[PDB]
Amino acid sequence: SKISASRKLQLKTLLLQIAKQELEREAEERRGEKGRALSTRAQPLELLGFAELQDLARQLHARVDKVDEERYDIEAKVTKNITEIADLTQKIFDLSADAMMQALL
Amino acid sequence: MDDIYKAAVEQLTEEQKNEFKAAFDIFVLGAEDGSISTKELGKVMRMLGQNPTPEELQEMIDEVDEDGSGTVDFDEFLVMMVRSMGKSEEELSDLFRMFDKNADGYIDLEELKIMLQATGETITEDDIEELMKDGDKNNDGRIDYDEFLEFMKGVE
Amino acid sequence: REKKKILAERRKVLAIDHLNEDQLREKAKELWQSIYNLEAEKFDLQEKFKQQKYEINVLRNRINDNQ
Ligand SMILES: [Ca+2]
Ligand SMILES: [Ca+2]
Ligand SMILES: [Ca+2]
CATH class of the missing domain: 1.20.5 (Single alpha-helices involved in coiled-coils or other helix-helix interfaces)
Known part of the structure; x- marks a missing residue:
């Protein structure tokens, strides 16, 4: 092997540290995308x-x-x-x- | 789930490789080849709250016998002592889409390489090489969903 | 002169066209909240739909590659 199997694990652990973060933010652009589709589709009353x-x-x-x-x-x-x-x-x-x-x- | 045991074998403190080494010379106090077999593993198992059968004893050795002798020596003992000291499939699928940016159902080298760069750490040239072929267990250029699991076993 | 259209367009008459205005003020509200709650359920049901087109896309890649 060209690299230490303890660094191979270090990289692997660091990849899933951002795919979770890029998912806690994907599900965040979608929280806003909701309310922006609920002031267009559900124009509040007055x-x-x-x-x-x-x-x-x-x-x-x-x-x-x-x-x-x-x-x-x-x-x-x-x-x-x-x-x-x-x-x-x-x-x-x-x-x-x-x-x-x-x-x- | 193999090259994750060596990761916690390399990271074993030398203040811990001293206890294990000491407790391994007591393990083999009576074996010719100086290594743990089924006679010795018989002792510290039934003299420890079990009574495993002689074949069931030899299959706790074949899992770490990377030498084919049935004699778990020292370097095969630390592998055993770290198999007893993860991440879920339902979760490794909502992560499998943050790799597959073009949304094709696979992870080609340019999709993993952009993920490696966002880690804040420094990627070389050989890091990317050994990783893809660790996952691509058939050299088809991509890590499909069945391999992205056998890839990321036990990753915290 | 369809039987269901005379009857469908008669739920309005029986539920609105019969009483107070200071009750119409507090009924016209909750009729909108019934839509905002219903227009949100329609959003989280389209996002989930987009995600299933991907799961099925991935699954259909596994039943054909593992044969
Ligand atoms: Ca051996
Ligand atoms: Ca892809
Ligand atoms: Ca593959």
């Missing part, structure tokens, strides 16, 4: 007159019945992917000391 205040709540009420339809049809695509993964994963799967020292010395 107030009206006892008339055309009403034709707002009848539009939100018509939005929820659609939003949850948008959420359902993507769920059943995630739900189906979970099924195929454990179906793919099934195909591929088929293919002491300190008590001895104390009792000697």
